[PDB]
Write a protein that binds this ligand. Structure first.
Ligand SMILES: *C(=O)[C@H]1NC[C@@](C)(O)[C@](O)([C@H](CC2CCCCC2)NC(=O)[C@H](Cc2ccc(OC)cc2)NC(=O)[C@H](COCc2ccccc2)NC(=O)CN2CCN(C(=O)OC(C)(C)C)CC2)O[C@@H]1C
Ligand SMILES: *C(=O)[C@H]1NC[C@@](C)(O)[C@](O)([C@H](CC2CCCCC2)NC(=O)[C@H](Cc2ccc(OC)cc2)NC(=O)[C@H](COCc2ccccc2)NC(=O)CN2CCN(C(=O)OC(C)(C)C)CC2)O[C@@H]1C
Ligand SMILES: [Mg+2]
Ligand SMILES: [Mg+2]
Ligand SMILES: [Mg+2]
Ligand SMILES: [Mg+2]
Ligand SMILES: [Mg+2]
Lengths: 221, 211, 204, 222, 233, 195, 196, 196, 195
C-alpha cells in the first residue's frame, strides 16, 4: 500500500513495511520510501528489485544532472527519465511508483505505471492495498489540507491497507516534503502491529544438537 | 519403496513409512502393509487413498469368500479380485502398485504384483515404488535362494534403508514381515534415524556420507 | 523444469549477542536421486560469509564470480570487503542479469570489522535485498525454516545458545523437505574467531 | 471457464495429550487478498466427544462436516444410540471423502477426541480419504510453517540429551493441557507473523472425558 | 459452465445496534455498456428479510422467482404462516446456500454473489453471504465485487468487531453506507448514481428506500489538473 | 549413449561406458568408445544428445592438448574438471546448449591421488568416490553405497563394476551391448580388453 | 474514453471525458486527455496511455525543433508527424489520436489517426470506446460553421451521451477552444451535463 | 441487424432493417425480422437466424395452445414464454429478442430479452449490432405518449442512422403498427430514409 | 510385451513370444508367458497395452472353452480367428478399446493343415505363412521372405526362428529377455523348454 497527499505548503508520501514472496512475509519491516534526491522521494509497488533498481538509476542520473546544471533537481526530470526508461522496456520492468517532491518550481505529486504512463493528482494510491487506501482518501480528502491533516490522512489511508489488505501489514513509514524546509523521513511513524510476548522460551539446553566435527575457520592471511 | 521376495524360509516383506505431498513430507510413520488375514499380506505404493481404500476393501472380499466357501482365499484369487477391480477403473486415474504375499497349502508361499494398469504377475522378487530401482540394486546383488531367515530379514531391511537414503520420496522407518506355512510374523519398526548410523558403523558401508 | 528445486538445499542465518550464525544442508540431487552428500552451500571472502541455495551450477558459478570480484576489491582498496558493501555487490551483480537471472537464493552473514556490529541479509534471484536483524532463510524448505525460526528465535543469544537454535531450526525444517537434508554444516562467527560444526542428522 | 474450487485460507492444528486432545483453528476466512470474515469458526463439536475441522475450500469443508454430523445422527438411530468411537468416525470420513474421488472435497481434514481407552486421539485425512492416527498434525495454508515446530516441541525430534554425545534421544513424554495450549498459542502467533492468510482470531476446542470446552484468543489483524 | 451477460455490481451491508442495512445500485451492465438503468437488486422476503444480489441478472430473476415461490409454499397448510412459522432470514439463506452449492457441484453455477440481510424472530441481527461457489461467511460488514475492496474498509472503521454493534446507531450506520455508495460511484466503472437501500430494524421493521442518489460529490479540484506531467496550460 | 559409470578406488579411477549406439529401432554399432583421453593421466567419458557428445569431448580434448604443448606440463584433474564445468556452465545459457553429461577420471601426480568428477550438462560438478549419469545411477548408487569400501584395490574395483553391470543387464529395459572399461592410475590410462 | 474535435466559424474545439480505467477500476477520475503539442496544435488521446503519452511527447519535441528552424508548423505537418510514428510502429502501438489545430491562414482543421496510422481530414471527428454510442447522434446534429456556443453545446451533449452509456468514460468534460483570440480551457461537471 | 420497439399513445410500433449477412456477403437483402407469435403479439429477432426462428415457432405454438384453453394471452405471458426458452437453453442459444404486444387493458408494452435470457419491461427497446450507434440518438429524441406519425418518424430516423454506420444493417426499413384499430405493415425504401 | 512371432511350416505352427515385462526403467519379470491355450489344437500369443493383453486373452479363452463344453467339439482355427477378429472389430468402436495384437496358431484336424492368423487391435485379420506384431516385423518379414520355404519340417522351422531371434537380439534397442517357443501340430500344443 503506498499513498501521496498534496497539502498547502508541500506533499506527503506514506507506505506500509511488508515484503511478500507468494503468501509468505519475506520482510516484516522493509523500507518502500526511496530518495531520488534530497527533496524528491519515491514510493514503490510491484517487482521489489525493479522499483529499487529504477529509483537508484534515475537518482544517480539526477545527481549528475544537478551537478552539471548547478541547479536543484526537479520532480518533472525524475518523472520524464523514469517514464522514458520504463516505456523503452515495454512493461517488462515491473515498477509502479508514486513520485513526490519539492523543487524551485513548487510541490509535485505523480504516479508512474510499469508501461510508462504518468498521472497528476492531489491524492494517489498504488499497490494491492490501493483500493482500501483510496476508499479512505475519497472519504476524507479536502482541498487546503494543513501539514498535520495531510500526515493523518496519509497514515489513515495506509492503515486501511494494513488491516483490510493481506498484501500489506506491519508499520507506517512517512516522508514529509515541505516547500522551504528539509524533507523529514519519519521511519516507523506508526507501529500498531507489535508481536505479543510469547508463552514460552524455546531457548534450548546446551548440547541438545548432535555434532560430528568441529574446526576453527581461518578468515586471516 | 516396498519389497517382497521368496527364499528357502518363506517370504520376506519390507516397506518404508513415508507419505509425500509433492516435495512436502506428509508423514514419517505410515503403515504400507495391510494384514488381510493371518496368512495374507498386502503392500501399498502409489495414491495413499487409492491404496488404503481398495486394499481394506480387498480384506472385506477375502472375508466374504471364507464365509461362503468355508476356506481361506488363495493368493491367486485374492490378487485377481484386486487386479479385476482396478482394470474396471482403467483410464480413470487410479494409482496403485501392490504386492499380495501369502501362504496357502495348495499354492505354497506366493507373491503377486498387481498395478493400476491391470498388470498381474506371479514372481519370486518384486520392488515397487519411486525407490524400487535403489531397492533392486542392493537386493538383486546379495539375493540367494538359501538366505537364512535371519540374513533374508536383514537384506530386506538393508534394501529399504538403501532406498530410504538415495530416494528423496522414501524414508522414515522400515517395517518388516516374515511369511511362513504358520502365517505372517511382524519383525518390528526400525527408524532410519538410528538404523542408518548403526548399519554404517557395524557394516562399514555408506562411505559416501560424512561419518 | 523449476530451476530453484532440481538440486534442492537450504541456508539459514541468525544474529546473536556480538555474533552471527549461518548454516546449510549438504544435499545435491537430480530431483528424486540424491547424488552428493558433501555439497556445501556456504563460502567466505575474508570475514564475509555467503550461503547460496538454488540451481547448483549457479551456486558454483556465483561463488567463483564473487571470489573474483572480492579479490580485485582487496587489491585496489587494500582491505577486505565488509558485509554491508558485499551485500550491495551481490545485489548489483544479480540485477545485472535481470532478463536471464541466476536461479539462486543468496544469504550474506558477517561482523563489520570496524563497528563490531553483527550483519545478515538475503536476496531474491534478481537482486532485491531483504535485510533482517533476526534471521534470513532460503531454499526448498524456506516455509519450514520461516516456521522454525519464528518460534525458536529470541534476540541476544550467546554464541553457544545461538548454535542450538539455528541447528534445531535447520535440522527440523530439512526433515519435512524431500529435497533438503543429507547432512548439515553450522558456522558460529564471533569478532575474531569462526567455529565450523558438522551436525549429525537423519540420512533419508 | 468455470472453476468449481477456491481457497479460503486459514490453518488448523490438532495435538493429543494422555487423557485430552486439542483441535485449534484461526477464525480468519479469505479469498485472494480480501478478508471475508475475522471470525468464521471452522472447528466444530460433532457430538460423541469428536471435534472436526475441514480446512481449505470452505464450501467443501462445510459440506463434509454437515455430512459427518448427519452420519453420527444416523449411527445413533440405526445402532441403538451407540457411541461413535474416534476410529469408527475416522473410517466413516474415509468413505465420505473417497465417494468424491473423481471430483474431490478440496480440504485437509483433522478430527480429535478420545480413543476407546480414554487416551488423546488425532486423525488427519488427505482430500480423497487417505488417513492415519498421529500425536499431532497441522493443516491448511501455514501447515508447512507449523508442522516442523510440532515435530520438534511435541515429539522432541532432533533433540538429544545434553552431554550424551548425540547417542541418547530426549525422552518422548505426554504434555499437560497447560503446555499444549502454550505450543498452540505460539504456533499461531508465529504463523500469523509470516503467513498473510493466517490472523484475526484463534479458537481452541479441548476434549476430555468431561466433554468439549472452548478457549478463544485475539491474533494480529494485519 | 456459463459466462455472465447482464450484470449488477456491488451489494454492501452492515449490522447496527437494533438491525441491519443493505444497499445496491439500480444498473444492469452489458460488459462496458451501461444498458439498463431501473434494475432492483434488493428483493424483500416477508417483513424481516432483504436478499441483495450481484452478478448475472438472468440468474438473479430466477432467484426472485424461487423466493416468491418459497413464500407461497410456506403458507400452504400453515395457519401460523404470518406468526411463529413465518420464513426467517436464516431459513431463506440456508435454502439459497443449498441451491448455490448444488448448482456449482453440477458444474452449472448461478453466477451471483448474494447477501441475506434481516432480523430473526428473537430480535437477533442476521447477515450472511453466499456466492456461485457455495462459499458462505458472516461478518459485522459484508460486500460483493468492488464493495469488498472499497466499502468494507470504510464500514469496518465504524464496526470493527462484534462489541462495536451495540454502540452503532442506525443514523451512523446508514451514513457509512451512503458514503460507501458515493466512493463506489467515484471508483467503480460498472456502478451507477441511482441506488436502493433497505433497513431491517427489530422495532420499526422493514424500511425500503428507492430512487436514492449519490450527493455531495467533490469534483472542483479537477479544473486545476493540467496534462500528465510537464504541461502547464 | 545412456550408461557411463566411474569408481575411484585406492590408487586408480575406473570408467565403464556402454558400447551401444542406437537410432530408432536399429542398434547401428555395438563397439562404441564413449571416451577421449584429455591428457596422459586424465580420461573423460560422455553421454547425451547425438552429435553433441563427440563434438564436445573432442573440443575439450583439443584445448587440454594445446595447454599441455604451450606450458610443456599436464593440468591437474581438478583444473581440467573446473575448465570443463565452466565450458558447460557457458553452454547452458547459449543459443543451442551442449546436451552432454561427463565423468572425468584422473590421477593427480602431485598429490598421488585418484580423482573422479561427475559433471552434468548444466555444469553441476561434484567430486565422488563413485558416480553415474542417466538411469544407471538409480541402480548403481545404492548398490555401491552397500559394497564400496574406500581402501579397495584396482582388482576389487573391477569386481565391484561387474556387480554394477550384472545388475544393469538384469533390470535395465534397453540392450546397451556391454561396457568398455578403462583404468586411470599413476602409470596413465589402459583399457581392459575383455569384460 | 470519449474524445472529439469539432471545426466551427472561429476555429476548432477539442472535447474529452476525464476517466481512465484498469478493468472496472477507475485508476484516475480527473485525467487530462487534451494535450498540447504546440501553442495552437492540440490532440485528444485514446488507447494505451503509455503509447499516446510517449507519442505526444515525441511530437512536441519534433514541433519545438521544427519551430526553431522553419517557424510555426501547419496542423497538417503535426498530423503528418503523428501518422509517421503511428504507421511505422503500428505493430507495437495501440494509439487512436485526434489532431486539432488553428493556423491563421487555414483556420480550424481536424485530422483523425485511427489504429492503422491512416490519416483522415474531417470537419469533426469522434473516437474512444464511448464514441460508438454517439455516431448516430453526432451525424444528425453536426452542421458546418457553427458558433462557439453551439459547438460547445454539440460537444457537451455528445460526450454527455457517450459518458451515460460507456462505463469506460465518465468524470468531467474537459474542452480546449482554439481561435485567433488564443487558447481557452473549459471544464463541465457531472451535476451540469448528466441531466441534459 | 437493427431492431427496435416503441410504445406510444395508441399502442406500440416494431421496426427492423431487412439485411442478413454471412460475413461480408448479404445472404438476403429483403429479410422480414418482424415475426407474429399472436394476432397482436409480435417480436423483432436478432442473433442466430436458426435459433430465433426455432424459438419464435415454438412460442407461436405455445400461444396458439394457450388461446385454445384460456383465451388471448397477455404481452407479459408471451415475453415469459420467450424468456423460459432463452434462459433454460442459454448455453446453446444466440438470441436477442424484443417482444411487443397490444392488450386492450394493458395498451402497448415492450419487453427485451438480451443474450442471458433476463427480461426487461421498457417504454422502448433497441437491439442488434446496429443499435450501438443510436443509443445516444434514441435516448435524446424519445418522449413517452408520442403520436403514430411521431413514433414512425422516431423509428425511421433511428434505424436510418443504424443502417448508415452498421455494415450488418441495410435494405428496407420494415415496421408493424399494433393498436386497437388492428395490424398495419409499413415499408420504407433506401431512396427515402438514406437522405433524412 | 513387444515381440511376438509366428511361422507356419509343413505340419506345425511355431509361436515365439518375448519373456520381458517392463514398467519404467525396471524389468519387473524375465519369464512371462504371453500365450493362452484357447483349445487343445489352438494357441493365441498377444502383445499391447498393459492389463488389456491378459484380460482380453483370458476372456477369449473362457468363450472358446465354453463353446467346447457346450458342443463337445473343438472349433476350427479359422472359426476361432473369425470370433477373435469380430471381438476386436467390436472393441475398436467401444468406450475404451482393447489395445491388443494377437497371433493365432492352430492345427485344423479336419483339413490336416497348420494355420497362422495375424490380427491387430483394429480387427485386421490375415492368414500368413509367417507373421509378427510391433517393430519385430521390420526385421523378420524380409529375413523370412529370403529364408522361408513352404515345405520345411518343424526342426527347420525352429532354426528359421533362431535366425529371427539372433537378428532381433543384434539390432533391437530393448532387452526382451529371450523367447518362449510353442509348437502347435496334430498332437496338440507343447513348449520347447530351452531356447
Ligand atoms: C501495498 O500495496 C503493498 N502491497 C504489498 C506488495 C507486496 O504487493 C508490495 O508491492 C511490495 C513492495 C516492495 C517491498 C520491498 C521494497 C520494494 C517494494 N512488493 C513485493 O513485495 C514484491 C511482490 C511481488 C510483486 C510482483 C511480482 O511479480 C513477479 C512478484 C512479487 N516482492 C517481490 O518481488 C519479492 C521480493 O523478495 C524479497 C525477498 C528478500 C530477501 C529474500 C527473499 C525475498 N521477490 C519476488 O517476487 C521474486 N520474484 C522471483 C521471480 N521474478 C521474476 O521476475 O522472475 C524472472 C525469471 C522473470 C526474472 C520476480 C521476482 O508493496 C506494496 C506497496
Ligand atoms: C516407495 O517407493 C515409496 N515412495 C514414497 C511414496 C510417498 O511415493 C509412496 O507411494 C506413498 C505410500 C502411501 C502412503 C500412505 C499409505 C499408503 C501408501 N504414497 C504417497 O504418499 C502418495 C503419493 C502420491 C502418489 C501418487 C499420486 O498420484 C496422484 C499422488 C501422490 N501421497 C498422497 O497421495 C498424498 C497423501 O497425502 C498428502 C496430503 C496431505 C495433506 C494434504 C494434502 C495432501 N495425497 C495426495 O496425493 C492427495 N491427492 C489428492 C488429489 N488427487 C487427485 O488425483 O485429484 C484429482 C483432481 C486429479 C482427481 C490425488 C491425491 O510410498 C511408496 C511405497
Ligand atoms: Mg507498448
Ligand atoms: Mg529420502
Ligand atoms: Mg531430508
Ligand atoms: Mg497476517
Ligand atoms: Mg459512465
Amino acid at each position: 500500500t503506498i499513498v501521496g497527499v498534496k497539502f498547502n505548503n508541500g506533499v506527503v508520501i506514506a507506505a506500509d513495511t511488508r515484503s511478500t514472496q507468494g503468501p509468505i512475509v519475506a520482510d516484516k519491516n522493509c523500507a518502500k520510501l526511496h530518495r531520488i534526491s534530497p527533496k524528491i522521494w519515491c514510493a514503490g509497488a510491484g517487482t521489489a528489485a525493479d522499483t529499487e533498481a529504477v529509483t537508484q538509476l534515475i537518482g544517480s542520473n539526477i545527481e549528475l544532472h544537478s551537478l552539471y546544471t548547478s541547479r536543484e533537481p526537479r520532480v518533472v526530470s525524475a518523472l520524464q527519465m523514469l517514464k522514458q526508461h520504463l516505456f523503452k522496456y515495454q512493461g517488462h520492468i515491473g515498477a509502479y511508483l508514486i513520485v513526490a517532491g519539492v523543487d524551485p518550481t513548487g510541490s509535485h505529486l505523480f504516479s508512474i505505471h510499469a508501461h510508462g504512463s504518468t498521472d497528476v493528482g492531489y491524492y494517489l494510491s498504488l499497490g494491492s492495498g490501493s483500493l482500501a487506501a483510496m476508499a479512505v482518501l475519497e472519504s476524507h480528502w479536502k482541498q487546503d489540507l494543513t501539514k498535520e491533516e495531510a500526515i493523518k490522512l496519509a497514515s489513515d489511508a495506509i492503515q486501511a491497507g494494513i488491516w483490510n489488505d493481506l498484501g500489506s501489514g506491519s508499520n507506517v513509514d512517512v516522508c514529509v516534503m515541505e516547500i522551504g524546509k528539509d524533507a523529514e523521513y519519519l521511519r516507523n511513524y506508526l507501529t500498531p502491529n507489535v508481536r505479543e510476548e510469547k508463552q514460552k522460551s524455546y531457548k534450548f539446553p546446551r548440547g541438545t544438537t548432535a555434532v560430528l566435527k568441529e574446526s576453527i575457520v581461518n578468515i586471516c592471511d | 519403496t516396498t519389497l517382497a521376495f521368496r527364499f528357502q524360509g518363506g517370504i520376506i516383506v519390507a516397506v518404508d513409512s513415508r507419505a509425500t505431498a509433492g516435495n512436502w513430507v506428509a508423514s514419517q510413520t505410515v503403515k504400507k502393509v495391510i494384514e488381510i488375514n493371518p496368512f495374507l499380506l498386502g503392500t501399498m505404493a502409489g495414491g495413499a487413498a487409492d491404496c488404503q481404500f481398495w486394499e481394506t476393501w480387498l480384506g472385506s472380499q477375502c472375508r466374504l469368500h471364507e464365509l461362503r466357501e468355508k476356506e481361506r482365499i488363495s493368493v491367486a484369487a485374492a490378487s485377481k479380485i484386486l487386479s479385476n477391480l482396478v482394470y474396471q477403473y482403467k483410464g480413470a486415474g487410479l494409482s496403485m502398485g501392490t504386492m499380495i504375499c501369502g501362504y496357502t497349502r495348495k499354492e505354497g508361499p506366493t507373491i503377486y504384483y498387481v498395478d493400476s494398469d491391470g498388470t498381474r504377475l506371479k514372481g519370486d522378487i518384486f520392488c515397487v515404488g519411486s525407490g524400487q530401482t535403489f531397492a533392486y540394486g542392493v537386493l538383486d546383488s546379495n539375493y540367494k535362494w538359501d538366505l537364512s531367515v535371519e540374513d533374508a530379514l536383514y537384506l530386506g531391511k538393508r534394501s529399504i534403508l538403501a532406498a530410504a537414503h538415495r530416494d528423496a520420496y522414501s524414508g522414515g522407518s522400515v517395517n518388516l514381515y516374515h511369511v511362513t506355512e504358520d502365517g505372517w510374523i511382524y519383525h518390528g519398526n526400525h527408524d532410519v534415524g538410528e538404523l542408518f548410523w548403526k548399519v554404517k558403523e557395524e557394516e562399514g558401508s555408506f562411505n559416501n556420507v560424512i561419518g | 523444469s523449476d530451476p530453484s528445486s532440481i538440486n534442492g538445499g537450504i541456508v539459514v542465518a541468525m544474529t546473536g549477542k556480538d555474533c552471527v550464525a549461518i548454516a546449510c544442508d549438504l544435499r545435491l540431487g537430480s530431483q528424486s536421486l540424491g547424488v552428493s552428500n558433501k555439497f556445501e552451500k556456504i563460502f567466505h571472502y575474508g570475514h564475509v560469509f555467503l550461503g547460496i541455495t538454488g540451481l547448483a551450477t549457479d551456486v558454483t558459478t556465483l561463488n567463483e564470480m564473487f571470489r573474483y570480484k572480492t579479490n580485485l576489491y582487496k587489491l585496489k582498496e587494500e582491505r577486505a570487503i565488509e558485509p554491508e558493501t558485499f551485500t550491495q555487490l551481490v545485489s548489483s551483480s544479480l540485477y545485472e542479469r535481470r532478463f536471464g537471472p541466476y536461479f539462486v537464493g543468496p544469504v550474506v552473514a558477517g561482523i563489520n570489522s570496524k563497528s563490531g556490529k553483527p550483519f545478515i541479509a538475503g536476496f531474491d534471484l534478481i537482486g532485491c535485498i531483504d535485510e533482517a536483524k533476526d534471521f534470513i532463510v532460503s531454499g526448498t524448505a524456506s516455509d519450514q525454516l520461516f516456521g522454525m525460526c519464528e518460534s525458536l528465535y529470541e534476540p541476544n543469544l550467546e554464541p553457544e545458545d545461538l548454535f542450538e537454535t539455528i541447528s534445531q531450526a535447520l535440522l527440523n525444517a530439512a526433515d519435512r523437505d524431500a529435497l533438503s537434508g543429507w547432512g548439515a554444516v553450522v558456522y558460529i562467527i564471533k569478532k575474531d574467531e569462526v567455529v565450523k560444526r558438522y551436525l549429525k542428522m537423519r540420512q533419508d | 471457464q468455470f472453476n468449481p474450487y477456491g481457497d479460503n485460507g486459514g490453518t488448523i492444528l490438532g495435538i493429543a495429550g494422555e487423557d485430552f486432545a486439542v483441535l485449534a483453528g484461526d477464525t480468519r476466512n479469505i479469498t485472494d487478498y480480501s478478508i471475508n470474515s475475522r471470525y468464521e469458526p471452522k472447528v466444530f463439536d460433532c457430538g460423541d466427544n469428536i471435534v472436526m475441522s475441514a480446512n481449505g475450500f470452505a464450501a467443501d469443508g462445510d459440506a463434509l462436516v454437515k455430512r459427518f454430523k448427519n452420519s453420527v445422527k444416523w449411527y445413533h438411530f440405526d445402532h441403538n444410540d451407540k457411541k461413535l468411537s474416534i476410529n469408527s468416525a475416522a473410517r466413516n470420513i474415509q468413505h465420505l471423502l473417497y465417494g468424491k474421488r473423481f471430483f474431490p472435497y478440496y480440504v485437509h481434514t483433522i478430527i480429535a477426541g478420545l480413543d476407546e481407552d480414554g487416551k488423546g486421539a488425532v486423525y488427519s485425512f488427505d482430500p480423497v480419504g487417505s488417513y492415519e492416527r498421529e500425536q499431532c498434525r497441522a493443516g491448511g495454508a501455514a501447515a508447512s510453517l507449523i508442522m516442523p515446530f510440532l515435530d520438534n516441541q511435541v515429539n522432541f525430534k532432533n533433540q538429544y540429551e545434553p552431554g550424551t554425545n548425540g547417542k541418547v534421544k530426549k525422552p518422548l513424554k505426554y504434555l499437560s493441557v497447560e503446555e499444549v495450549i502454550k505450543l498452540v498459542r505460539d504456533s499461531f502467533t508465529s504463523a500469523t507473523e509470516r503467513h498473510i492468510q493466517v490472523g484475526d482470531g484463534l479458537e481452541i476446542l479441548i476434549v476430555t472425558k468431561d466433554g468439549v470446552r472452548k478457549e478463544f484468543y485475539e491474533l494480529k489483524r494485519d | 459452465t456459463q459466462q455472465p451477460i447482464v450484470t449488477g455490481t456491488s451489494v454492501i451491508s452492515m449490522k447496527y445496534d437494533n438491525g441491519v442495512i443493505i444497499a445496491a445500485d439500480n444498473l444492469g451492465s452489458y460488459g462496458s455498456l451501461l444498458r439498463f438503468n431501473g434494475v432492483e437488486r434488493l428483493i424483500p422476503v416477508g417483513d424481516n428479510t432483504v436478499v441483495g444480489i450481484s452478478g448475472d441478472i438472468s440468474d438473479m430473476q430466477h432467484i426472485e422467482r424461487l423466493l416468491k415461490d418459497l413464500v407461497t409454499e410456506n403458507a400452504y397448510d400453515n395457519p401460523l404462516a404470518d406468526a411463529e412459522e413465518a420464513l426467517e432470514p436464516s431459513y431463506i439463506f440456508e435454502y439459497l446456500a443449498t441451491v448455490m452449492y448444488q448448482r456449482r457441484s453440477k458444474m452449472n453455477p448461478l453466477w451471483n454473489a448474494i447477501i441475506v440481510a434481516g432480523v430473526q424472530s428473537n430480535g437477533d441481527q442476521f447477515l450472511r453471504y453466499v456466492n456461485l461457489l457455495g462459499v458462505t461467511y458472516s461478518s459485522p460488514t459484508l460486500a460483493t465485487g468492488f464493495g469488498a475492496h472499497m466499502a468494507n474498509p470504510l464500514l469496518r472503521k465504524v464496526v470493527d468487531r462484534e462489541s462495536d454493534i451495540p454502540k452503532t446507531t442506525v443514523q451512523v450506520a446508514e451514513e457509512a453506507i451512503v458514503n460507501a455508495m458515493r466512493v463506489l460511484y467515484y471508483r467503480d466503472a460498472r456502478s451507477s448514481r441511482n441506488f436502493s437501500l433497505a433497513i431491517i430494524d427489530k422495532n420499526t421493521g422493514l424500511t425500503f428506500k428507492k430512487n436514492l442518489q449519490v450527493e455531495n460529490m467533490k469534483w472542483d479540484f479537477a479544473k486545476d489538473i493540467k496534462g500528465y506531467g510537464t504541461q502547464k496550460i | 549413449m545412456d550408461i557411463i559409470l566411474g569408481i575411484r578406488v585406492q590408487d586408480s579411477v575406473i570408467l565403464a561406458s556402454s558400447k551401444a549406439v542406437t537410432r530408432g529401432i536399429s542398434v547401428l554399432k555395438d563397439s562404441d568408445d564413449k571416451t577421449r583421453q584429455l591428457s596422459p593421466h586424465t580420461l573423460m567419458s560422455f553421454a547425451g544428445e547425438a552429435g553433441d557428445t563427440v563434438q564436445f569431448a573432442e573440443y575439450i580434448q583439443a584445448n587440454i592438448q594445446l595447454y599441455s604443448i604451450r606450458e610443456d606440463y599436464e593440468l591437474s584433474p581438478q583444473a581440467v574438471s573446473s575448465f570443463v564445468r565452466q565450458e558447460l556452465a557457458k553452454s547452458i545459457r547459449s543459443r543451442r546448449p551442449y546436451q552432454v553429461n561427463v565423468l572425468i577420471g584422473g590421477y593427480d601426480k602431485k598429490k598421488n591421488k585418484p580423482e573422479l568428477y561427475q559433471i552434468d550438462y548444466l555444469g553441476t560438478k561434484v567430486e565422488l568416490p563413485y558416480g553415474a549419469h542417466g538411469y544407471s545411477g538409480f541402480y548403481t548408487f545404492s548398490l555401491l553405497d552397500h559394497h564400496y569400501r574406500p581402501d579397495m584395490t584396482t582388482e576389487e574395483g573391477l569386481d565391484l563394476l561387474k556387480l554394477c553391470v550384472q545388475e544393469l543387464e538384469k533390470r535395465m529395459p534397453m540392450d546397451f551391448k556391454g561396457v568398455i572399461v578403462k583404468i586411470v592410475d599413476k602409470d596413465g590410462i589402459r583399457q581392459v580388453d575383455d569384460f | 474514453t470519449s474524445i472529439m474535435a469539432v471545426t466551427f466559424k472561429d476555429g476548432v474545439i477539442l472535447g474529452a471525458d476525464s476517466r481512465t480505467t484498469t478493468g472496472a477500476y477507475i485508476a484516475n477520475r480527473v485525467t487530462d486527455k487534451l494535450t498540447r503539442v504546440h501553442d495552437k496544435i492540440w490532440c485528444c488521446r485514446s488507447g494505451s496511455a503509455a503509447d499516446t503519452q510517449a507519442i505526444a511527447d515525441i511530437v512536441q519535441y519534433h514541433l519545438e525543433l521544427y519551430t526553431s528552424q522553419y517557424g510555426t508548423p501547419s496542423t497538417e505537418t503535426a498530423a503528418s508527424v503523428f501518422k509517421e510514428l503511428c504507421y511505422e510502429n503500428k505493430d507495437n502501438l495501440t494509439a487512436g489520436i485526434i489532431v486539432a489545430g488553428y493556423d491563421d491562414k487555414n483556420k480550424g482543421e481536424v485530422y483523425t489517426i485511427p489504429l492503422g496510422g491512416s490519416v483522415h481530414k474531417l470537419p469533426y471527428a469522434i473516437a474512444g470506446s464511448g464514441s460508438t454510442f454517439i455516431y448516430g447522434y453526432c451525424d444528425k446534429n453536426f452542421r458546418e460553421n457553427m458558433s462557439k456556443e453551439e459547438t460547445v453545446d454539440f460537444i457537451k451533449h455528445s460526450l454527455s451521451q457517450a459518458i451515460k452509456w460507456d462505463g469506460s468514460s465518465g468524470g468531467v468534460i474537459r474542452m480546449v477552444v482554439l481561435t485567433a483570440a488564443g487558447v481557452e480551457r473549459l471544464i463541465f461537471y457531472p451535476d451540469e451535463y448528466e441531466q441534459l
